[PDB]
Design a protein around this ligand. Structure first.
Ligand SMILES: CC(=O)N[C@H]1[C@@H](O)[C@H](O)[C@@H](CO)O[C@@H]1SP(=O)(O)OP(=O)(O)OC[C@H]1O[C@@H](n2ccc(=O)[nH]c2=O)[C@H](O)[C@@H]1O
Length: 548
């Protein structure tokens, strides 16, 4: 009935879902102390869960100014500003929070991830080390998907995944166990928040179309954790399966809904990313659970039975670093939308390129563009006189930093061209102007590598020692382009330099990409469906399914 109780009751009704049970309380905190950093910040915090981000930043910014020593606040300010699309000021707040809590791993991880996204490489080495050590000591505050950006072995990655999983598993009682059906068509489920204009939808669409057509004994179920975005993918995907909208259903309710349909094999296409909902899988709604295609590494999770990769991106040499039993498709692990008619792009000038000159490009998100990957790309521009680096536009002053670094490396900043965000059909068209795609290490082009190749642009890569660092390589290998996989950085530059400065050889290579594009099984979704569908049937029998 008075007073820190007030703000208290707000702190866990709110992050327990029920927010106006919550609201009613802060507003009464304000009742006792009118505008008080600890209270203010909290109004602020409702707004945020209430999706009213814009209001939040202003409130939080007032509190912060009155309490520039308060790190709880600094963190909430950052969250807000971030979700109010103020990238650079969001990192500012995260920085101050870190100043104020050096040992707090959660905060260190946050700031490392946010800095990579802005290519702010200040003290990166230290930050990276810290974050890895936090994984190492099993206090992994570290979010596994962000963790993919660090130069960590498959061992550390497994450590980081199993840490998080085990925390989730402890906080949760599974559903009563069940078993794969003996008789009758196989119910195969896929959960994701990518069923629309997102990588996941974009890679699986033509696959599921093919499955509907070719594997009529497999009953496909898609469990959409995101609403309809009005894209052709969402429609196409809803056309090729039974698509359940489970958006804004609780973890529990979703599992219960998955169970209600008797799914036999449930694929997680989420994965440890945003919009995840791992706690959904922890409830074991299905008797056999599989990790595939969405998160490029191990789940760590004991609720995860299998992982699906391929002989290249998940070689036997890597098997021990996955908690799942490993399964493999007959070619690349990644499917793609081979219905895509690549449009003609607007001319070079309209795309902001010069007319003459070799155009190298890399369209990965900013967090993949790390010191090592950039240096090596710029290393190519130096030796090739004419040439040009085409990149995606990133948030905040990321582009500015890259320019400054380019100059810091001894390259005219005018030589990097920044494509803004374009809807898929128009973006994809931009590849016809690119001469060579320059991959990133340790976090490869995934979907984009596939995009690039589909339009006929070759991808140069350095297959590393983890799954995420071998995705570009798996495509090149399964395409038959083994000379696009090079041993190391020096070989990369050497190879790309040789290519760029020899237009003759370069054109031969585009030509060769084309043949393989249509010849190999990598881009032959019918074949992919057959393989996939057959692997599913076997897996089920190995669990008790008696077909028919
Ligand atoms: C950054 C982040 O936390 N999440 C996401 C992602 O979840 C999100 O849905 C996506 C926006 O749809 O941005 C990030 S891509 P990720 O790193 O996760 O994987 P990627 O293979 O990099 O995916 C490249 C995607 O962008 C497409 N893309 C890109 C640029 C453009 O201008 N147009 C476009 O369609 C490209 O065709 C492909 O569809």
């Amino acid at each position: 009935q008075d007073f820190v109780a007030w703000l208290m009751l707000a702190d866990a009704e709110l992050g327990m879902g029920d927010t106006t049970a919550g609201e009613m309380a802060v507003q009464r905190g304000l009742a006792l102390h009118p505008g008080h950093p600890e209270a203010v910040a909290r109004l602020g915090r409702v707004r945020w869960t209430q999706q009213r981000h814009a209001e939040a930043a202003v409130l939080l910014q007032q509190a912060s100014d009155a309490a520039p020593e308060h790190p709880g606040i600094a963190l909430w300010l950052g969250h807000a500003l971030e979700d109010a699309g103020q990238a650079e000021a969001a990192a500012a707040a995260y920085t101050r929070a870190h100043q104020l809590l050096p040992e707090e791993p959660y905060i260190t991880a946050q700031l490392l991830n946010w800095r990579r996204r802005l290519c702010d490489w200040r003290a990166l080495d230290v930050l990276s080390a810290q974050v890895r050590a936090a994984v190492a000591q099993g206090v992994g505050a570290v979010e596994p998907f962000a963790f993919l950006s660090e130069d960590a072995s498959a061992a550390e990655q497994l450590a980081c995944a199993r840490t998080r999983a085990q925390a989730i598993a402890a906080s949760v009682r599974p559903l009563a166990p069940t078993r794969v059906r003996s008789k009758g068509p196989l119910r195969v489920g896929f959960v994701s928040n990518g069923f629309g204009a997102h990588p996941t939808g974009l890679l699986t669409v033509a696959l599921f179309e093919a499955l509907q057509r070719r594997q009529p004994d497999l009953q496909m179920h898609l469990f959409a954790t995101s609403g309809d975005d009005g894209s052709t993918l969402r429609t196409r995907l809803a056309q090729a399966s039974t698509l359940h909208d489970v958006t804004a259903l609780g973890h529990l309710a979703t599992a219960k809904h998955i169970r209600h349909h008797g799914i036999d094999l449930l694929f997680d296409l989420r994965g440890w990313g945003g919009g995840g909902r791992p706690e959904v899988f922890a409830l074991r709604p299905a008797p056999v659970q599989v990790n595939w295609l969405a998160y490029p590494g191990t789940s760590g999770a004991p609720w995860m039975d299998y992982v699906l990769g391929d002989a290249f991106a998940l070689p036997p040499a890597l098997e021990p670093f996955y908690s799942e039993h490993v399964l493999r498709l007959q070619g690349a692990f990644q499917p793609s939308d081979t219905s895509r008619v690549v449009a003609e792009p607007p001319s070079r000038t309209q795309c902001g390129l010069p007319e003459q000159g070799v155009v190298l490009c890399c369209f990965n998100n900013s967090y993949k563009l790390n010191p090592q990957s950039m240096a090596r790309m710029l290393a190519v521009l130096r030796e090739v006189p004419d040439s040009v680096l085409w990149l995606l536009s990133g948030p905040g002053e990321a582009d500015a930093r890259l320019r400054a670094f380019a100059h810091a490396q001894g390259v005219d900043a005018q030589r990097l061209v920044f494509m803004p965000k374009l809807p898929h059909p128009q973006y994809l068209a931009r590849y016809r102007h690119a001469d060579l795609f320059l991959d990133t290490h340790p976090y490869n082009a995934h979907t984009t590598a596939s995009d690039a190749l589909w339009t006929g642009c070759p991808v140069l890569t350095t297959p590393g020692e983890t799954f995420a660092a071998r995705v570009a390589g798996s495509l090149n290998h399964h395409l038959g382009l083994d000379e696009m996989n090079v041993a190391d950085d020096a070989a990369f530059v050497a190879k790309a330099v040789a290519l760029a400065s020899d237009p003759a050889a370069l054109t031969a290579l585009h030509a060769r990409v084309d043949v393989l594009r249509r010849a190999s099984g990598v881009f032959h979704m019918d074949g992919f469906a057959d393989d996939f569908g057959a692997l599913l049937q076997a897996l089920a029998r190995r669990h008790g399914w008696l077909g028919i």
